[PDB]
């Protein structure tokens, strides 16, 4: 019997997650391992439910658990859990992202284009997300005149919110979106409103999904090298299973950075 790894993701509809999955599955498969994916964005299921479903079939789990790191590691006992993008707590391992760095770099690009009227579009129902608070922190630190927009995390939801906001605030000449999915919605709002990109208003996303290269204009984004993210998660898993890495230690907590990828949506 070969090593089996559970992969838990909150949906397949946000294109980040299938790209994340594909990367992890690619590298795990080349180690000769099996991977089973549980998409839990359905029927009110949670990150904890995903882990409970997978544990009897797997020797380990990697996933976005939506807060349930502690309880999930407990369900797993001595099988390692590697959580992404959350407080690791009692999890055996962790992969996080330097949002402060990302916030800094992304704002810088808009500042370099002397953008006077900036909006940040947040995923939600004041900023609520980790990346949200970083961007807001950096914008307030610089003294930029900026506004917060909030929308559910879909393209359509982001378009509608942006479209409305542009009517109330037509001067807006720079927009940072929570992610590339929402960013695609923003672009459409600008398109529909008759504004050119980047001339009348620039747009920067976050994630670096392939979708960005197919949009018109192609989308500038704070990208994550998904080969690096997967590699980080699999090697960390190797260490934890070999015992090279002690569960819960410093050496089991990794942080990765976004790289700015400039495309057509900025000048």
Ligand X SMILES: OC[C@H]1O[C@@H](O[C@H]2[C@H](O)[C@@H](O)[C@@H](O)O[C@@H]2CO)[C@H](O)[C@@H](O)[C@H]1O
**Residues 96-135, mask of contacts with a copy of itself (x by CB under 8 A):** ----------------------------------------
Spatial distance between the Cα atoms of 17 and 21, rounded to a whole number of angstroms: 6
Q: Are 58 and 35 a contacting pair, CB within 8 Å?
A: no
64, interface contact from ligand X, a copy of itself, none, CB < 5-8 Å by kind: ligand X
**Residues 150-189, mask of contacts with a copy of itself (x by CB under 8 A):** -----x----------------------------xx-xx-
Closer residue to ligand X, CB minimum distance, 20 or 33 = 20
Closer residue to a copy of itself, CB minimum distance, 13 or 129 = 13
In 3-state terms, what secondary structure has residue 119?
A: strand
Binding of ligand X by 207 (CB under 6 A): yes
192, interface contact from a copy of itself, ligand X, none, CB < 5-8 Å by kind: none
Spatial distance between the Cα atoms of 2 and 60, rounded to a whole number of angstroms: 12
Q: Angle between the 130-142 and 99-112 helix axes, to the nearest 10 degrees?
A: 40
Q: Are 129 and 85 a contacting pair, CB within 8 Å?
A: no
38, interface contact from a copy of itself, ligand X, none, CB < 5-8 Å by kind: a copy of itself
Spatial distance between the Cα atoms of 108 and 101, rounded to a whole number of angstroms: 11
Binding of ligand X by 130 (CB under 6 A): yes
**Residues 185-214, mask of contacts with a copy of itself (x by CB under 8 A):** x-xx--x------------------xx-xx
Stretch that binds ligand X, among 73-81, 83-91, 136-144, 156-164 (CB under 6 A): 83-91
Cite the DSSP H helix spans in 169-205.
180-193
Q: Are 90 and 69 a contacting pair, CB within 8 Å?
A: yes
Closest by Cα among 29, 53, 56, 86 to 234: 29
**Residues 16-45, mask of contacts with ligand X (x by CB under 6 A):** x-----------------------------
Closest by Cα among 266, 114, 257 to 177: 266
């Amino acid at each position: 019997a070969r090593t089996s790894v559970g992969l838990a993701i909150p949906d397949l509809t946000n294109p980040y997650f299938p790209a994340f999955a594909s990367s992890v599955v690619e590298l795990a498969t080349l180690r000769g391992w099996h991977v089973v994916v549980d998409d839990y964005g359905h029927g009110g299921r949670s990150g904890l439910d995903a882990v409970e479903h997978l544990a009897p079939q797997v020797d380990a789990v990697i996933g976005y658990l939506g807060g349930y790191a502690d309880q999930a590691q407990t369900v797993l006992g001595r099988r390692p859990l590697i959580v992404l993008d959350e407080n690791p707590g009692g999890a055996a391992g962790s992969i996080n992202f330097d949002y402060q760095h990302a916030a800094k770099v992304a704002v810088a690009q808009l500042m370099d284009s002397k953008r006077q009227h900036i909006a940040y579009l947040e995923a939600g129902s004041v900023p609520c997300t980790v990346r949200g608070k970083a961007v807001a922190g950096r914008l307030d630190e610089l003294g930029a005149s900026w506004s917060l927009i909030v929308a559910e995390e879909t393209a359509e939801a982001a378009r509608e919110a942006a479209a409305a906001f542009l009517r109330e605030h037509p001067e807006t000449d720079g927009i940072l979106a929570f992610n590339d999915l929402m960013a695609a919605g923003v672009l459409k709002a600008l398109s529909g409103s008759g504004r050119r990109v980047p001339e009348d208003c620039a747009v920067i996303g976050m994630d670096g999904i392939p979708l960005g290269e197919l949009l018109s204009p192609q989308l500038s984004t704070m990208a994550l090298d998904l080969r690096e993210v997967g590699r980080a998660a699999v090697e960390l898993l190797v260490g934890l299973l070999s015992g090279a890495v002690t569960p819960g230690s410093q050496s089991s907590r990794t942080t990765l950075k976004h790289r700015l990828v400039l495309r057509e949506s900025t000048e």
